[PDB]
Write an enzyme that holds these catalytic residues in place. Structure first.
Site, PDB file in Angstrom:
ATOM      1  N   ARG A   1      36.781  48.204  38.879  1.00 28.20           N
ATOM      2  CA  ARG A   1      37.631  49.293  39.392  1.00 28.20           C
ATOM      3  C   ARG A   1      37.039  50.666  39.067  1.00 28.20           C
ATOM      4  NH1 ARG A   1      42.636  48.406  39.476  1.00 28.20           N
ATOM      5  NH2 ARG A   1      42.904  50.631  39.911  1.00 28.20           N
TER       6      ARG A   1
ATOM      7  N   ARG B   1      43.185  49.430  30.415  1.00 27.49           N
ATOM      8  CA  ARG B   1      42.559  49.922  31.670  1.00 27.49           C
ATOM      9  C   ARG B   1      41.100  50.293  31.336  1.00 27.49           C
ATOM     10  NH1 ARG B   1      45.266  55.095  34.796  1.00 27.49           N
ATOM     11  NH2 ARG B   1      47.009  53.677  34.420  1.00 27.49           N
TER      12      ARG B   1
ATOM     13  N   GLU C   1      52.732  44.712  32.853  1.00 26.95           N
ATOM     14  CA  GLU C   1      52.281  43.895  33.984  1.00 26.95           C
ATOM     15  C   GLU C   1      51.027  43.097  33.687  1.00 26.95           C
ATOM     16  OE1 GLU C   1      50.957  45.170  38.087  1.00 26.95           O
ATOM     17  OE2 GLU C   1      50.032  43.304  37.276  1.00 26.95           O
TER      18      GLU C   1
ATOM     19  N   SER D   1      50.759  39.535  39.437  1.00 25.15           N
ATOM     20  CA  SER D   1      51.384  40.102  40.641  1.00 25.15           C
ATOM     21  C   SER D   1      51.190  39.134  41.842  1.00 25.15           C
ATOM     22  CB  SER D   1      50.788  41.484  40.895  1.00 25.15           C
ATOM     23  OG  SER D   1      51.479  42.140  41.934  1.00 25.15           O
TER      24      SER D   1
ATOM     25  N   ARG E   1      43.007  42.519  29.465  1.00 21.77           N
ATOM     26  CA  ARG E   1      44.426  42.898  29.354  1.00 21.77           C
ATOM     27  C   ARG E   1      45.315  41.901  28.578  1.00 21.77           C
ATOM     28  NH1 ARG E   1      49.020  46.195  32.968  1.00 21.77           N
ATOM     29  NH2 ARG E   1      47.344  47.634  32.536  1.00 21.77           N
TER      30      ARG E   1
END
Lengths: 421, 421
Positions: free
Chosen positions: A256, A271, A345, A348, A386
């Site tokens: 990312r 992140r 989170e 998803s 994460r």
């Protein structure tokens, strides 16, 4: 992408989806642009139709007349090019607009943004500590489990793990792949780059183009998820009805570009630019009941991984403004992070109906021999680093050492992560 | 980078090594620029000295000879500038070609190109087949162990693995990390991108800039090896003597742009843009005895992995023309590929002395309290998918399915790899 035919015979529905999902699209200007392209195609065939007639009779017209015929030909040529050139300009402007039309969300979707999201259920609780807990950064620091020098080498929003925690990252990705294989999903290991076409397919282009890192001097881009690759493998094939559903568990490194400086600033493992993710991908038939069955399977798989990992979680129904343009329904799974007193989170789960299949050209032959657009779904199986934030905090001992959940002991070779270097 | 002192006092050595290694570098021009730059600095100091000296007398000066002092002082001023400016242009340029200067080869290295490479020794036999052996492509094609559609998604020199072979890739990567960790190396999982400084540090820039992908609109590049990240960690630190040798085993996905068009057929699992690699890296004291002991260990680890893996191999001394500019010694380990009837390289063991230590600024405090540039070495532990090509062909059974070595059964759960489709 949505059916254009239905876009014109039912735009009210699509107007509601544009409003409720907060998409910056003028439906009416789209529909108007559409009737430009359409008039132009008619007048353009006309001009070449006239020109055909002229060209037929150019020789075996008398010399006296063939000169006139040539003059009408040239002017018709002026026309055909002028008209074609404007159609081209218009067509590609339409095509861009059409790449933005959102899928309507399911009727029970919460209306609003992030605030409108609704907790479905909660399984487990925040652990009750006989000593004051440390956060995941302090656990790493204490036990010599990461390398802060990576920041000088690679930059910000970067991580390097060390000793038993480096091994634990690899153990988790193997565990997720074996779990998936034993659930009937086809385990694949994949590349982390793809052509633009594969990003249009999933709808990461155009809407999330800014999240993606391009490879300089190529036509390739680095992918944020194995979903980009998995979704494009079957592009242009007509799958047999008996292949369905197609269940893929794809492993790939992921990349990312950013996110606007973090929601509990920048870092830890939360992140980072580069990570590892095992995704679940489902290509099924164009019925709601088959999509609903697949959605419940993908969700239960993620729930089961979290139970084996011994983590507290909750499920949340995602609202219309938070879903994405291509989602019908989205449920997020969130894990409790003790240091931040908060659920965060980790998974998803999305049902996209035929919004990706219309753009990636995925089709099957139904039981009546009709060729249809298939339905696609996806959810995460496990992404690192994460979950390492959550595992460390939830499983920390008085020592500062960390317990390994039972199911993971065979993969590690030990019951306790030890301090390193 | 080489020591300019040693360079200045032994150009004999560096000239022999420029041509023995086929280095496009005129040593006379370099030694010329060095002298110019030293004389300029000497001079610029003489001017600065007198320029100031002069003014101390100019306050105290009979009008008579204050003309003499303004005159001399202004001439000195005008000259200081020309010296400052020339020293700018030259000192910059001398740097650029200090970066091209090669390390001398070890005495015993064969002189010449890739042709002059010398087999040291071969261990184990080619396999004996009771049937016609298939090549690695035909075994994957037969058993449905690879995804040919990946070529449309990601272009050529891509692979995607399926089923039991996808799991086997992940198992080998974990095996190598466990082997390394049991052998006293410190395990790490790393990024696959680094700033330009890390690439200069190793010698990848400027010589192999061509072999490297850049992340567009960024100061980061993708690494073709964990060495790039490993070598830049302790850049600018003075390591204590008791920390030494640093033994690191880094894992990272690795990228190559393949400015490598080919020879004749390599187009299965052999030359892919993206792969996974576990690297051995040693940072030791500036002693030849210490380098040679580290070199021996690094090679024995690699031989032991290949024994564990039940593969026939040989050792090859690499020639002066095939080493690269920074090496002192290079030994390739090559594994037998039955279908080609020959050995293809799997591991490459290098000693660089302090050539990358001077570029990356790696230093230690020795037993006498003097600060020295360290010595560095590296070798592959295991890279995929190239090792898979050798595993499939050597371990193939009659039915087209592939045996798992004893050492890997605990990582696989099964003794034989099963087809999927």
């Amino acid at each position: 992408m949505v059916d254009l035919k239905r876009l014109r015979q039912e735009p009210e529905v699509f107007h509601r989806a544009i409003r409720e999902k907060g998409v910056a699209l003028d439906l009416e200007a789209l529909l108007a642009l559409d009737r430009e392209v359409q008039e132009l195609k008619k007048r353009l065939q006309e001009v070449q139709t006239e020109r055909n007639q002229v060209a037929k009779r150019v020789p075996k017209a008398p010399p006296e007349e063939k000169e006139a015929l040539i003059a009408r030909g040239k002017a018709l040529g002026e026309e055909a090019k002028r008209l074609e050139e404007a159609l081209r300009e218009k067509e590609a402007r339409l095509e861009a607009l059409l790449l933005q039309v959102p899928l309507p969300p399911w009727p029970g979707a919460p209306v609003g943004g992030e605030e409108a999201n609704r907790e479905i259920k909660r399984v487990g609780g925040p652990p009750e500590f006989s000593f004051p807990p440390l956060d995941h950064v302090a656990l790493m620091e204490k036990n010599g489990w990461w390398e802060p020098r990576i920041s000088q080498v690679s930059g910000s929003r970067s991580y390097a793990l060390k000793g038993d925690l480096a091994l634990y990252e690899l153990a988790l990705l193997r565990f997720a792949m074996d779990f998936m294989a034993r659930r009937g999903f086809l385990p694949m290991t994949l590349p982390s780059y793809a052509r633009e076409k594969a990003f249009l397919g999933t709808g990461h282009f155009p809407a999330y183009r800014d999240q993606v890192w391009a490879i300089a001097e190529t036509d390739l881009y680095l992918t944020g998820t194995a979903e980009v690759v998995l979704n494009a493998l079957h592009s242009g094939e007509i799958l047999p009805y008996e292949a369905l559903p197609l269940r893929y568990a794809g492993y790939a490194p992921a990349f990312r570009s950013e996110a606007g400086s973090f929601g509990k600033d920048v870092r830890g493992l939360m992140r980072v630019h580069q990570f590892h993710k095992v995704e679940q991908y489902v290509l099924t038939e164009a019925s709601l009941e088959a999509s609903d069955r697949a959605f419940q399977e993908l969700l239960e798989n993620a729930e089961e991984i979290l139970r084996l990992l011994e983590l507290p979680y909750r499920l949340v129904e995602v609202a219309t403004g938070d879903m994405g343009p291509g989602k019908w329904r989205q449920v997020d799974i969130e894990v409790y992070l003790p240091s931040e007193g908060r659920y965060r989170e980790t998974h998803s789960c999305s049902a996209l109906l035929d919004w990706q299949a219309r753009r990636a050209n995925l089709r099957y032959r139904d039981p009546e021999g009709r060729v249809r657009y298939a339905y696609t779904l996806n959810n995460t199986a496990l992404a690192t680093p994460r979950i390492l934030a959550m595992l460390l905090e939830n499983h920390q001992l008085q020592d500062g050492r960390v317990r390994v959940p039972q199911a993971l002991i065979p993969y590690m070779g030990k019951e306790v992560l030890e301090p390193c270097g």
